[PDB]
Design an enzyme around this catalytic site. Structure first.
Site, PDB file in Angstrom:
ATOM      1  N   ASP A 161      43.597   6.173 -60.989  1.00 11.92           N
ATOM      2  CA  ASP A 161      43.663   5.004 -60.061  1.00 11.92           C
ATOM      3  C   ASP A 161      44.036   3.785 -60.910  1.00 11.92           C
ATOM      4  OD1 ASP A 161      43.680   3.572 -57.715  1.00 11.92           O
ATOM      5  OD2 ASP A 161      41.462   3.584 -57.517  1.00 11.92           O
ATOM      6  N   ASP A 186      36.583   1.512 -63.169  1.00  8.53           N
ATOM      7  CA  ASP A 186      36.788   2.395 -61.994  1.00  8.53           C
ATOM      8  C   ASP A 186      37.497   3.684 -62.349  1.00  8.53           C
ATOM      9  OD1 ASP A 186      36.841   3.539 -59.592  1.00  8.53           O
ATOM     10  OD2 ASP A 186      37.695   1.816 -58.435  1.00  8.53           O
TER      11      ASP A 186
END
Ligand SMILES: NC[C@H]1O[C@H](O[C@H]2[C@H](O)[C@@H](O[C@H]3O[C@H](CO)[C@@H](O)[C@H](N)[C@H]3O)[C@H](N)C[C@@H]2N)[C@H](O)[C@@H](O)[C@@H]1O
Ligand SMILES: Nc1nc2c(ncn2[C@@H]2O[C@H](COP(=O)(O)OP(=O)(O)NP(=O)(O)O)[C@@H](O)[C@H]2O)c(=O)[nH]1
Ligand SMILES: [Cl-]
Ligand SMILES: [Mg+2]
Ligand SMILES: [Mg+2]
Length: 292
Positions: free
Chosen positions: A188, A207
């Site tokens: 991501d 993340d």
């Protein structure tokens, strides 16, 4: 004041932890993140669609990566079926944006690109045996998502919508971009997850919640993206050149395929989570793309 509840949960699950201050700093549609005591990030979620893998990945990487680039280091975790919390010290810095990039000198831009390339080379090079369980097969996942579509709402879609999906499935079947190197990817890797220090050097990455062992090409998908959120195709191309030993044309194909899939993925998410809003958004996006 979701804040009061979360404060309660934090202090209740983490024995000796005292919350002097707490504010919401980010929100997904499934999750909420909190800045606590102006020092700690607490990522939280209410339902195995939880944070166990993400925790395993931080722990694997903090053990094995040799880099000055900071990543989350989990000091607190509570993981249950109904609730997951991860706490770690906030990485300090400014998130990369297109606007910021455009103010950087050419050298600053080059060094940022180099830092990125270098990080990705290191991470993709890791022997991933110790987290061999965290595998992700994107092609297979899409096939399973297509089946779910067929079992639920496919028959009620419009012809235009059906054709968009079938045309995508035809492309998926013909592509070779899944047949290359597999490795551990962030998965991501967009600029809202990249932090800069005061000299505009890459200081941190956050993340890793979608990370897994997957196509090497995956970590270039957002770097190659041409959109308001991302920097642009040339940014990714340049990074790919610095990274080396990778078929750039196939990376771009992979990105283009994943972008074609986005509205369908949006629809599938809505089905899986019983959220009509997303089903509608994704179908509408098919029409906007069809009429470009
Ligand atoms: N919003 C508008 C844009 O949306 C997508 O790009 C964005 C992705 O959606 C983000 O990723 C999120 O969505 C993924 C599934 O799609 C999830 O896996 C992931 N966990 C989520 O964080 C990613 N980080 C940044 C990227 N710019 C489309 O490509 C782009 O054309 C469109 O303009
Ligand atoms: N400066 C800074 N902000 C952080 C840090 N960790 C998280 N944040 C902020 O909190 C937001 C949420 O973090 P993130 O891991 O991306 O979670 P999410 O995408 O919303 N949830 P999920 O990954 O489960 O889908 C980030 O977008 C960022 O604004 C950090 O270490 N430093
Ligand atoms: Cl709908
Ligand atoms: Mg995020
Ligand atoms: Mg995430």
């Amino acid at each position: 004041t979701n804040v009061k509840a979360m404060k309660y949960l934090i202090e209740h699950y983490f024995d000796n932890f005292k919350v002097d201050s707490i504010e919401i700093i980010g929100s997904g549609y499934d999750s909420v993140a909190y800045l606590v005591n102006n020092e700690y990030i607490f990522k939280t979620k209410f339902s195995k669609k939880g944070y166990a893998k993400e925790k395993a990945i931080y722990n694997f990487l903090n053990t094995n990566l040799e880099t000055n680039v900071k990543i989350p280091n989990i000091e607190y975790s509570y993981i249950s079926d109904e609730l997951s919390i991860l706490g770690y010290k906030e990485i300090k810095g400014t998130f990369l944006t297109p606007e910021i990039y455009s103010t950087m000198s050419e050298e600053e831009q080059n060094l940022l690109k180099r830092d990125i390339a270098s990080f990705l080379r290191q991470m993709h090079g890791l022997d991933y045996t110790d987290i061999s369980e965290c595998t992700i097969d994107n092609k297979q996942n899409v096939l399973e998502e297509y089946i779910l579509l067929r079992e639920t709402i496919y028959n009620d879609l419009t012809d235009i919508e059906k054709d968009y999906i079938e045309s995508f499935m035809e492309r998926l079947n013909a592509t070779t971009v899944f047949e290359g190197k597999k490795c551990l990817c962030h998965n991501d890797f967009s600029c809202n997850h990249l932090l800069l220090d005061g000299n505009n050097r890459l200081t941190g990455i956050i993340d890793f919640g979608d990370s897994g062992i997957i196509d090497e090409y995956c970590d270039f998908i957002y770097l190659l993206e041409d959109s308001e959120e991302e920097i642009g195709t040339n940014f990714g191309e340049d990074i790919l050149r610095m990274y080396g030993n990778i078929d750039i044309e196939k990376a771009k194909e992979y990105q283009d395929i994943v972008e074609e899939y986005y509205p369908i993925e949006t629809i599938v998410y809505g089905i899986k989570n019983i959220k009509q809003e997303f089903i509608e958004n994704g179908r509408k996006e098919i029409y906007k793309r069809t009429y470009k």
